[PDB]
Amino acid sequence: AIPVHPTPASVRLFEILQGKYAYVQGQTIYANLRNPGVFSRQVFTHLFKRAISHCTYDDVLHDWNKFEACIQKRWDSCASRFRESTFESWSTTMKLTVRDLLTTNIYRVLHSRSVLSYERYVDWICATGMVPAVKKPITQELHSKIKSLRDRCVCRELGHERTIRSIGTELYEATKEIIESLNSTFIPQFTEVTIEYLPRSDEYVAYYCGRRIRLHVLFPPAIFAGTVTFDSPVQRLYQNIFMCYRTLEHAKICQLLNTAPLKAIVGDILTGSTASAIEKLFNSPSASLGARVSGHNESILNSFVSQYIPPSREMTKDLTELWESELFNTFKLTPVVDNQGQRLYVRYSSDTISILLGPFTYLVAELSPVELVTDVYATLGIVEIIDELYRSSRLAIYIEDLGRK
Amino acid sequence: AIPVHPTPASVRLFEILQGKYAYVQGQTIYANLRNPGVFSRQVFTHLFKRAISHCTYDDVLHDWNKFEACIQKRWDSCASRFRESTFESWSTTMKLTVRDLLTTNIYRVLHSRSVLSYERYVDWICATGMVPAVKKPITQELHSKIKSLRDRCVCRELGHERTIRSIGTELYEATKEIIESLNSTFIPQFTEVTIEYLPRSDEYVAYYCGRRIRLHVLFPPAIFAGTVTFDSPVQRLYQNIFMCYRTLEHAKICQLLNTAPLKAIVGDILTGSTASAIEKLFNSPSASLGARVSGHNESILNSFVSQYIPPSREMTKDLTELWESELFNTFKLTPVVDNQGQRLYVRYSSDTISILLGPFTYLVAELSPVELVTDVYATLGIVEIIDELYRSSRLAIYIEDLGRK
């Protein structure tokens, strides 16, 4: 039995998740990888993939035959290129008339209340290399918020495209198993739960409201007999950040201690009429400073003077790029820049989703049939990846099979 | 029961949303993402999509048939290219007749009094990660602000375009479903309502006029035993901005205390005749400074002088880019810049609308059938997105269906 969370050193470590003690410009990049949305990209494009894969080629071809049966009563040798153009435009409106309803329903199921958050995951793994895998069995939100007819109300039109009537049902029921899986799982905060490690027969015990909950080691900490330190991104910086905090408060201490314009040895304010503002502090005891010897018999032979400025902002300036280097390296962050651009587009890499969302979606989340994605799947627009999925979809490759008749 | 909102540290946090305590050049970018109208982009292109989706192909083809019936009484072998050119003209005035109608009606319904504001939204989520949901049931303003004929008297002309008489009515009634949905909700101010936490069996309780009113969590605060800290963009900067405020007021304190040109120790003004301006302050007690020892028996052996200014503007300057990095990172802001351009066009990204208006339009506001936008949907002109929608809209594809006869 040894504590992991509620030790003073580890709560000092958990504090740097927020900004309470020390903060610089490099720690702003920590929130950028703390940004969720990339997890919604995962379930998003994965349910697009599930909706787009399960389709039959034989349905869309008879849809095209009935589509031509629609146009022959509306409109010989010129009909060859007429049928080519109307098929091309049929493919275009097929992409459109799937993509709009997908954009409605999938964003509708996407921005539900999810008690699981990537944001509450990424700070925990970077803090201690450990994550509480909490299985919270309340799952009555999804059927209450969405039960039926949300897939049925929008699709009622003239052209009874049975492709949509086949895909909307399977994509609708597929989300009812996926949102189930994420909302069944749970990740808490830190300030009210704790985590316990027993050295004797080494396992780890989670705690929240009095029970041992499931867990997943990723970065096992170094337990010496005197203290425990965690192999973590932030605790690879820990006492350097505390050193910068110490010298900054030290700098303000000396700055506030030499404010007197003159040193003796014994032996509403921000804005106002400056003439009266002179009077309001010249009488104040901030002006004088008479230093003291303790013993009255103890005399002073010589006296010196040296105000001193410790290099505070210099200590902040290198520690900014200290933060930048660690969060470019241990999490693969490639700054997409312009010519002499000062880090304008900070983006996930190929392997950093395998090292953050890879373990996330497959260890603490039981999202079994979901995948990781490409660089340009997460880089591009979230609706602009939809037609790109379409460009390598089973559907549009069947339609480009129909692309030659 | 512990307070969240009216506590002194958190009301200092809600204050720095405004400019009252400390303010730098980086906090100017905070208003740029505070700009509403990007919510109007959402409802605007969503209702254009709703207007253009419900259209039928059969209405416009016989409309073109009657359009040719109009021109045969006004105007053989040359008639092939004559009919091609007049169809191209009919397409162009079709775009014109949807554009002028829609810009009147939709900018008319768009800039009504909306009690919901994105400006009143984005400040809450950045402050505490928390939003209070208010449902004000007063929804009687839509029938008074618009009844009918704003869509009709503009199109009451010679050519009875049944495309307009078919789609204007359904877009007209659909807008009433959307303005009702937004103005039913309400997001409040902060200086009169409160947010509050019960630690035991944790939930979050909102209050306006004595009722536990609805709300939604996004970023769970760190509640320790002494204080509460909210995982927020601004409170990740909180004591650094307070440190800059402290050193700026301390800098002005030392500047105001060191105005004397001469340091003794005991033992209308802005513009005027400068010869009399010498007279008006030389006799004044602002000039002199004779510092004091308390004890008259207490003597001084040695005495010093040290003027000192802390690096005030230096402490402001790095905190500018502190704000710049944080509001480029935790809200994804890509500065559209020129060669060595100093951050000229600060624009929303693909993912930051998913992290800000994504939760807004779907979770705190119950706008179900609305969508998100793209990068170029939000970048381009709001009338230049009309014709860009037309570059991929179902009626205009049906005109491009007719584009080859």
DSSP string, B86-127: HHHHHHHHHHHHHHHHHHHHHHHHHTS--S--SHHHHHHHHH
Task: Look up tokens 């999925």; give the residue.
Answer: A389
Question: Hey, what are A113's tokens?
Answer: 């209340």
Contact criterion met (CB < 8 Å) for B304 and A78: no
Whether the CB-CB separation of B263 and B291 falls below 8 Å is answered with: yes
Contact criterion met (CB < 8 Å) for B308 and A313: no
**Residues in chain A within 8 Å Cβ distance of B369:** 104, 154
Calpha distance A379→A381 (Å, rounded): 7
**Residues in chain B within 8 Å Cβ distance of A38:** 351
Mutation target among A43, A278, A298, A386 for the B interface, most CBs of B within 10 A: A278
Amino acid at A220: P
Pairing of strands B264-265, B290-291: parallel
Maximum alpha-carbon separation in chain A: 123
Calpha distance A175→A290 (Å, rounded): 75
CA B380 to chain centre: 17
Collect all residues with Cβ–Cβ distance below 8 Å to B108 and sequence separation of at least 6.
Answer: B146, B150
Closest partner residue to A111 among B286, B325, B362, by Cβ?
Answer: B362
Phi-psi region of A210 (alpha: psi -120 to 50; beta: other; left: phi over 0): left
Angstroms from A225 CA to nearest CA on chain B: 28
Closest partner residue to A28 among B329, B332, B359, by Cβ?
Answer: B329
Angstroms from A186 CA to nearest CA on chain B: 14
CA A85 to chain centre: 45
Collect all residues with Cβ–Cβ distance below 8 Å to B9 and sequence separation of at least 6.
Answer: B227
Whether the CB-CB separation of B210 and B105 falls below 8 Å is answered with: no
Whether the CB-CB separation of A289 and A262 falls below 8 Å is answered with: yes
Backbone angles phi, psi at A166, to 5 degrees: -90, -40
Contact criterion met (CB < 8 Å) for B304 and A263: yes
Closest CA to B187 of B203, B212, B209, B208: B208
Angstroms from B225 CA to nearest CA on chain A: 9
Sign of the C-alpha dihedral, residues A79, A81, A85, A88?
Answer: positive
Angstroms from B361 CA to nearest CA on chain A: 9
Question: Hey, what are A267's tokens?
Answer: 């032996």
Closest partner residue to B308 among A40, A82, A258, by Cβ?
Answer: A258
Whether the CB-CB separation of A30 and A323 falls below 8 Å is answered with: yes
Question: Hey, what are B345's tokens?
Answer: 């066009």
What HEC string does chain A produce?
CEECCCCHHHHHHHHCCCCCCCCCCCCHHHHHHCCCCHHHHHHHHHHHHHHHHCCCHHHHHHHHHHHHHHHHCCCCCCHHHHHHHHHHHHHHHHHHHHHHHHHHHHHHHHCCCCCCCCHHHHHHHHHHCEEECEECCCCCHHHHHCCCCCCCCCCCCCCCCHHHHHHHHHHHHHHHHHHHHHHHEECCCCCCCEEEEECCCCEEEEECCCCCCCEEECCCCEECCCCEECCCCCCCCHHHHHHHHHHHHHHHHHHHHCCCCCCEEECCCCCCCHHHHHHHHHCCCCCCCEECCCCCCCCCCCCCCCCCCCCHHHHHHHHHHHHHHHHHHCCCEEEECCCCCCCCEEEECHHHHHHCHHHHHHHHCCCCCCCCCCHHHHHCCCCCCHHHHHHCCHHHHHHHHCCCC
Backbone angles phi, psi at A240, to 5 degrees: -70, -40
Residue A310: half-sphere exposure toward Cβ, Cα within 13 Å = 19
Whether the CB-CB separation of B285 and A279 falls below 8 Å is answered with: yes
* DSSP 8-state secondary structure symbol assigned to residue B157: S
Which neighbouring-strand residues pair with A334? Answer: A347
Whether the CB-CB separation of A235 and B268 falls below 8 Å is answered with: no
Whether the CB-CB separation of A310 and A251 falls below 8 Å is answered with: yes
**Residues in chain A within 8 Å Cβ distance of B237:** 19, 23
Whether the CB-CB separation of A156 and A164 falls below 8 Å is answered with: no
Collect all residues with Cβ–Cβ distance below 8 Å to A97 and sequence separation of at least 6.
Answer: A161, A164, B394
Contact criterion met (CB < 8 Å) for A282 and B237: no
Contact criterion met (CB < 8 Å) for B302 and A381: no
Question: Hey, what are B94's tokens?
Answer: 């079709």
Question: Hey, what are B4's tokens?
Answer: 């969240």
Whether the CB-CB separation of B389 and B103 falls below 8 Å is answered with: no
Closest CA to B363 of B374, B373, B355: B355
Closest partner residue to A89 among B219, B372, B397, by Cβ?
Answer: B397
Calpha distance B90→A279 (Å, rounded): 81
Pairing of strands B222-223, B215-217: unpaired
Torsion, CA B178, CA B180, CA B182, CA B187, rounded to 10: 180
Whether the CB-CB separation of A396 and A109 falls below 8 Å is answered with: no
Whether the CB-CB separation of A211 and A135 falls below 8 Å is answered with: no
What are the b/e assignments for A238-258, b being 16+ CB within 10 Å? beebeebbebbeebbebbeeb
Contact criterion met (CB < 8 Å) for A191 and B258: no
Residue B303: half-sphere exposure toward Cβ, Cα within 13 Å = 14
Calpha distance A43→A49 (Å, rounded): 10
10 Å CB burial of residue B21 (0-12, 13-18, 19+) is middle
Torsion, CA A312, CA A315, CA A317, CA A318, rounded to 10: 170
Pairing of strands B134-135, B185-186: antiparallel
* DSSP 8-state secondary structure symbol assigned to residue B7: S
- CB contacts < 8 A, A to B, total 236
Q: Which residue of B has its CA nearest to A102?
A: B371
Mutation target among A43, A95, A111 for the B interface, most CBs of B within 10 A: A111
Closest CA to B336 of B300, B376, B307, B367: B376
Torsion, CA A48, CA A49, CA A54, CA A58, rounded to 10: 80
Sign of the C-alpha dihedral, residues B49, B55, B61, B67?
Answer: negative
Angstroms from B40 CA to nearest CA on chain A: 18
Give the length of chain B: 405
Neighbours of A277 (CB within 10 A): 19
Contact criterion met (CB < 8 Å) for A32 and B332: yes
Question: Hey, what are A15's tokens?
Answer: 């504090």
Q: Which residue of B has its CA nearest to A90?
A: B401
Closest partner residue to A307 among B247, B306, B332, by Cβ?
Answer: B306
Contact criterion met (CB < 8 Å) for A23 and B307: no
Q: What angle do CA B301, A259, B283 make, to 5 degrees?
A: 80
Q: Which long-range contacts (CB under 8 A, 24 or more apart) does B309-314 make?
A: B309/B251, B309/B254, B309/B255, B310/A255, B310/B247, B310/B250, B310/B251, B310/B254, B311/A313, B312/B247, B312/B248, B312/B251, B314/A313
Angstroms from A275 CA to nearest CA on chain B: 7
Torsion, CA A95, CA A100, CA A103, CA A105, rounded to 10: -120
**Residues in chain B within 8 Å Cβ distance of A28:** 236, 322, 325-326, 328-330
Closest partner residue to A313 among B265, B269, B311, by Cβ?
Answer: B311
Query: Reduced to 3 states, what is the DSSP secondary structure of residue B1?
Result: coil
Contact criterion met (CB < 8 Å) for A288 and B289: no
* Beta strand spans in B227-350 (E): 228-229, 264-265, 290-291, 300-303, 333-336, 345-348
Closest CA to A182 of A44, A50, A48: A44
**Residues in chain B within 8 Å Cβ distance of A279:** 285-286
**Residues in chain A within 8 Å Cβ distance of B58:** 74, 158
Whether the CB-CB separation of A150 and A191 falls below 8 Å is answered with: no
Backbone angles phi, psi at B97, to 5 degrees: -80, -20
Calpha distance A321→A77 (Å, rounded): 70
Collect all residues with Cβ–Cβ distance below 8 Å to B405 and sequence separation of at least 6.
Answer: A75, A78, A82
Query: Reduced to 3 states, what is the DSSP secondary structure of residue B67?
Result: helix
Contact criterion met (CB < 8 Å) for A259 and B257: yes
Closest CA to B165 of B152, B181, B184: B152
Angstroms from B156 CA to nearest CA on chain A: 28
Amino acid at A328: F
Contact criterion met (CB < 8 Å) for B306 and A18: no
**Which helix (H) or strand (E) segment is B353 a member of?**
helix B350-355
Calpha distance A328→B125 (Å, rounded): 28
Contact criterion met (CB < 8 Å) for A290 and B300: yes
Phi-psi region of B185 (alpha: psi -120 to 50; beta: other; left: phi over 0): beta
Mutation target among A92, A149, A259 for the B interface, most CBs of B within 10 A: A259
Neighbours of A168 (CB within 10 A): 20
10 Å CB burial of residue B300 (0-12, 13-18, 19+) is middle
* DSSP 8-state secondary structure symbol assigned to residue B267: -
What HEC string does A280-340 produce?
HHHCCCCCCCEECCCCCCCCCCCCCCCCCCCCHHHHHHHHHHHHHHHHHHCCCEEEECCCC
Question: Hey, what are A333's tokens?
Answer: 């962050």
Closest CA to A355 of A53, A121, A148, A168: A121
**Residues in chain A within 8 Å Cβ distance of B303:** 262-265
Closest CA to B383 of B34, B33, B151, B104: B104
Calpha distance A156→A146 (Å, rounded): 19
Q: How far is CA B214 from CA B17, B138, B365, in A?
A: 23, 17, 11
Rg (CA), chain A: 32
Calpha distance B72→B60 (Å, rounded): 18
Calpha distance A154→A171 (Å, rounded): 15
Residue B251: half-sphere exposure toward Cβ, Cα within 13 Å = 14
Calpha distance B334→B317 (Å, rounded): 21
Q: What angle do CA B26, B28, B32 make, to 5 degrees?
A: 120
Contact criterion met (CB < 8 Å) for A300 and B304: no
**Header resolution in angstroms:** 4.8
Calpha distance A175→A150 (Å, rounded): 13
Which neighbouring-strand residues pair with B197? Answer: B2, B204
Strands of A2-3's sheet in order across: A2-3, A194-198, A203-207
Rg (CA), chain B: 32
Q: Which residue of B has its CA nearest to A41?
A: B351
Whether the CB-CB separation of B322 and A25 falls below 8 Å is answered with: yes
Q: How far is CA B401 from CA A75, A80, A223, B98, B397, in A?
A: 12, 14, 71, 18, 6
Calpha distance A137→A184 (Å, rounded): 6
Torsion, CA A89, CA A92, CA A94, CA A100, rounded to 10: -140
Neighbours of A43 (CB within 10 A): 22
Pairing of strands B215-217, B130-132: antiparallel
- What crossing angle do the helices spanning A394-401 and A38-53 adopt, rounded to 10°? 40
Calpha distance B179→B109 (Å, rounded): 8
Calpha distance B67→B89 (Å, rounded): 11
